[PDB]
Structure formats: structure tokens, C-alpha cells
Amino acid sequence: IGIDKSDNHDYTKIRYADGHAIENAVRSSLKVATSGDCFVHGTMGHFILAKCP
Amino acid sequence: SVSQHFNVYKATRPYIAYCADCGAGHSCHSPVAIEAVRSEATDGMLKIQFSAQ
Structure with a gap:
């Protein structure tokens, strides 16, 4: 999270692997959620931060 | 009217x-x-009072 497919910092991109090539997914579609709904407190690289109930 | x-x-x-x-x-x-939750109905139906109109 935070880097576009073209290897550039971007706070609205998520490099998600697919087949053999990297893709670009909209960041606003992140739903880290236990039974409730975690309030994602900030992300970077491979690590999300959550405050799940 | 209203x-x-x-x-x-x-x-x-x-x-x-x-x-x-x-x-x-x-x-x-x-x-x-929020200022005061006022649950007083035996049925159960809160009356959340909060600083907006």
C-alpha cells in the first residue's frame, strides 16, 4: 500500500500481485475488519494498522 | 405545518x-x-442528544 504499479510513491495506490505482472488497485477499497469494522489508522508497504473491536 | x-x-x-x-x-x-444518552423507554429507543441541528 502506498506505491503504484510503476514503482512510485502514491498514497492512493496498492500494488497487488496478479498473474505475472503487478497491478494497481484503488486504495479506498481497503476493509480490514474483524467481526466489527477496524478503523485503519494508516498504512505503508506491507503493513496495515488497525484498531479492531 | 412543521x-x-x-x-x-x-x-x-x-x-x-x-x-x-x-x-x-x-x-x-x-x-x-454526544452530551447525554437518555434511554428511558421500556421498549428501548435511545434519545442521543448531540451538538448539531
Whole structure:
């Protein structure tokens, strides 16, 4: 999270692997959620931060 | 009509008040601030009062 497919910092991109090539997914579609709904407190690289109930 | 019921609010305004939480555990001074939950119906139906109109 935070880097576009073209290897550039971007706070609205998520490099998600697919087949053999990297893709670009909209960041606003992140739903880290236990039974409730975690309030994602900030992300970077491979690590999300959550405050799940 | 209902405008008569709202004839009182013409001399009122929302206010900013402390919250102690905004879904992220932080001081807010938010435009929306709960003041008193007033559960008094045996059926059960809260009467959340908060700093907005």
C-alpha cells in the first residue's frame, strides 16, 4: 500500500500481485475488519494498522 | 405545518464541544459531540442528544 504499479510513491495506490505482472488497485477499497469494522489508522508497504473491536 | 415546530430554532446554532474520541482515540473539538444518552423507554429507543441541528 502506498506505491503504484510503476514503482512510485502514491498514497492512493496498492500494488497487488496478479498473474505475472503487478497491478494497481484503488486504495479506498481497503476493509480490514474483524467481526466489527477496524478503523485503519494508516498504512505503508506491507503493513496495515488497525484498531479492531 | 412543521415550520411552526421549527419556529424555536431560528435563534439557535450548533456548537463545537470536546468529545474525547473520534473513532481514533484522540481529542476532537468536533462539530458533533454526544452530551447525554437518555434511554428511558421500556421498549428501548435511545434519545442521543448531540451538538448539531
